C-alpha cells in the first residue's frame, strides 16, 4: 500500500491536507506515495486513530509525543521537523514568555495574571512554564490543573477540560483543541496576548516574528527572563525558559509505514518545501499557521530506527513530564 493516511485536526488542517494530497498527485509518479486525509477533533483523537489503524501519521509537539507513546497507543517518532535553515538544521527550539512592553511585571510576578498557552501538554505552551512553576508553589494544590487555575486569574489552555476547570478557558471558552479556537497554538496564544485577553503568552522564539513583520511593532513586546528581568524579543538566546526538541511525525511502532511516511515527506519537501513553490507550501497556508506542520519548519529529517519516544525525548524531559503530571516535587 502506498497511501499515507494523514490525520488532520479539524477543518483548516483538513483543507490544507486536501491541498497537500492534490499537489503531491501533480508531481509524484502514479506508483509513488499518496496522501489520504482523515479528519479528527484533536491530536489525541489522531493518536488513537493511528493506534487503531484508522490513520498512519500525525505531527506532534514533543510534549504530546509522550502521550502518543503511552500504552495502549504505543506510537513512535519517525520523522522530525527541523528549524533555522537547511544549512544549520536545528532540532530544538526555545520556549519563551512574551509580554507587552511597559506592563512592568517580571517572572516572579505572574501570580494573578491572565495567561495564554498554546495547549495543555505542549512543550513551550505548558510543560516548560508550568513545570518550572508547580513545585515552587508553597501549595500542594499540585496535580496541576487546579493549581494553575488558582494561580492565574483566567487563562486560555486549549484542550483543558472547561467543565472541570472553567478558569483555564476564561480567555478562550470551551478550550477548543484545534485551530478553530483562535487562541490555539503558538500564534493563537500570541494573538491572545496581542488582543489584551491575557498578560503573557507561553510560545516559541520565532512566534512574534511570524506574526509581526515590522520591527517597530515587535518593539512594543519583550521577553520575561528567568532572572526576573526583561529583554528585547531578539534576545531569546539569552532570555528563554528552556530549549525543547523538535515537533515530530509519529506512527505505529509496528506496521506503521514509517518508510513510506518518510518517502512522502522527503519528496514533499523536495517540491513544496521551504521556498520551493508558489503553487503549494508545506510550511505555510492561507488557511492558518502551523497547519499539519510548523510554519517555522524548514524541512524534515529521518529519526533513527532504534529510537523510541523515550529515547527521542531524553531522560530529563520524560522525567519532568512524568513528574509534572504526578505533582512530584
Ligand atoms: Fe511545540
What CATH number has the domain bearing residue 27? 3.40.190.10
Ligand 1: centre distance to CA 124 (Å): 6
321 falls within a domain: no
- DSSP code of residue 91: S
Ligand 1: centre distance to CA 122 (Å): 6
139 falls within a domain: yes
Question: Experimental technique used?
Answer: X-ray
Verify that 67 and 116 share a domain, yes or no.
no
319 falls within a domain: no
- Among 53, 52, 60, 51, smallest CA distance to 78 is for 60
- Among 223, 251, 188, smallest CA distance to 6 is for 251
- Among 200, 16, 190, 234, smallest CA distance to 106 is for 200
Ligand 1: centre distance to CA 152 (Å): 22
Q: Is residue 287 part of an annotated ligand binding site?
A: no
Q: Is residue 117 part of an annotated ligand binding site?
A: no
Verify that 37 and 121 share a domain, yes or no.
no
Cα–Cα separations (whole angstroms), residue 100 to 103, 124, 168, 191, 192: 6, 18, 21, 12, 12
Q: Which residues span the domain enclosing 293?
A: 1-82+248-309
Verify that 50 and 73 share a domain, yes or no.
yes
Q: Is 3 helix (H, G, I), strand (E, B) or coil?
A: strand
Verify that 176 and 292 share a domain, yes or no.
no
* CA 124 – CA 135 distance, rounded (Å): 18
* CA 96 – CA 225 distance, rounded (Å): 8
* CA 165 – CA 115 distance, rounded (Å): 14
Ligand 1: centre distance to CA 317 (Å): 13
Q: Is residue 247 part of an annotated ligand binding site?
A: yes
Verify that 98 and 236 share a domain, yes or no.
yes
Verify that 238 and 271 share a domain, yes or no.
no
Number of domains in the chain: 2
Ligand 1: centre distance to CA 277 (Å): 25
Asked whether the beta carbons of 51 and 74 are under 8 A apart, the reply is yes
Ligand 1: centre distance to CA 31 (Å): 34
What contacts 124, CB < 8 A, 6 or more positions away?
A: 61, 93, 94, 95, 96, 118, 186, 202, 203, 204, 241, 244
Verify that 41 and 117 share a domain, yes or no.
no
Verify that 237 and 181 share a domain, yes or no.
yes
Q: Is residue 122 part of an annotated ligand binding site?
A: yes
Long-range pairs of 183-186 with CB within 8 A, sequence gap ≥ 24: 183/116, 183/156, 183/158, 184/118, 184/119, 184/158, 185/118, 185/119, 185/158, 185/289, 185/290, 186/118, 186/124, 186/125, 186/210, 186/289, 186/290, 186/294
Largest Cα–Cα distance of the chain, in whole Å?
62
- DSSP code of residue 183: T
* CA 68 – CA 76 distance, rounded (Å): 7
Asked whether the beta carbons of 79 and 302 are under 8 A apart, the reply is yes
* CA 186 – CA 107 distance, rounded (Å): 19
Ligand 1: centre distance to CA 93 (Å): 8
Between strands 92-100 and 200-204, the pairing is antiparallel
**Burial bucket for residue 226 (CB in 10 Å: 0-12, 13-18, 19+):** middle
Amino acid at each position: 500500500d502506498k497511501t499515507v493516511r494523514w490525520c488532520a485536526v479539524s477543518e483548516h488542517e483538513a483543507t490544507k491536507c486536501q491541498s497537500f494530497r492534490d499537489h503531491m498527485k501533480s508531481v509524484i509518479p502514479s506508483d509513488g506515495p499518496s496522501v489520504a486525509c482523515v479528519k479528527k477533533a484533536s491530536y489525541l483523537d489522531c493518536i488513537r486513530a493511528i493506534a487503531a489503524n484508522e490513520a498512519d501519521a500525525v505531527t506532534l509537539d514533543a510534549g504530546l509525543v509522550y502521550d502518543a507513546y503511552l500504552a495502549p497507543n504505543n506510537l513512535k517518532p519517525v520523522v522530525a521537523e527541523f528549524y533555522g535553515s537547511k544549512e544549520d538544521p536545528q532540532t530544538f527550539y526555545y520556549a519563551v514568555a512574551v509580554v507587552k512592553k511597559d506592563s512592568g511585571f517580571q517572572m516572579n510576578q505572574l501570580r494573578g495574571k491572565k495567561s495564554c498557552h498554546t495547549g495543555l501538554g505542549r512543550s513551550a505552551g505548558w510543560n516548560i512554564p508550568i513545570g518550572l512553576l508547580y513545585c515552587d508553589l508553597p501549595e500542594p494544590r499540585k496535580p496541576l490543573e487546579k493549581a494553575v487555575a488558582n494561580f492565574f486569574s483566567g487563562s486560555c489552555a486549549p484542550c483543558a477540560d472547561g467543565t472541570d476547570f472553567p478558569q483555564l478557558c476564561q480567555l478562550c471558552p470551551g478550550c477548543g483543541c484545534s485551530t478553530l479556537n483562535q487562541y490555539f497554538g503558538y500564534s493563537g496564544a500570541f494573538k491572545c496576548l496581542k488582543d489584551g485577553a491575557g498578560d503573557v503568552a507561553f510560545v516559541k522564539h520565532s512566534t512574534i516574528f511570524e506574526n509581526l513583520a515590522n520591527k517597530a511593532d515587535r518593539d512594543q513586546y519583550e521577553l520575561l527572563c528567568l532572572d526576573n528581568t526583561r529583554k528585547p524579543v531578539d534576545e531569546y538566546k539569552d532570555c528563554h525558559l528552556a530549549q525543547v526538541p523538535s515537533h515530530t511525525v509519529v506512527a505505529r511502532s509496528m506496521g506503521g509505514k514509517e518508510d513510506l511516511i518518510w518517502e512522502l515527506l522527503n519528496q514533499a519537501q523536495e517540491h513544496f518545501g521551504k521556498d520551493k513553490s508558489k503553487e503549494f507550501q508545506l510550511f505555510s497556508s492561507p488557511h492558518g499557521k502551523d497547519l499539519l506542520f510548523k510554519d517555522s519548519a524548514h524541512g524534515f529529517l529521518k529519526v533513527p530506527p532504534r529510537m523510541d519516544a523515550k529515547m527521542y525525548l531524553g531522560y530529563e524531559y520524560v522525567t519532568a513530564i512524568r513528574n509534572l503530571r504526578e505533582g512530584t516535587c
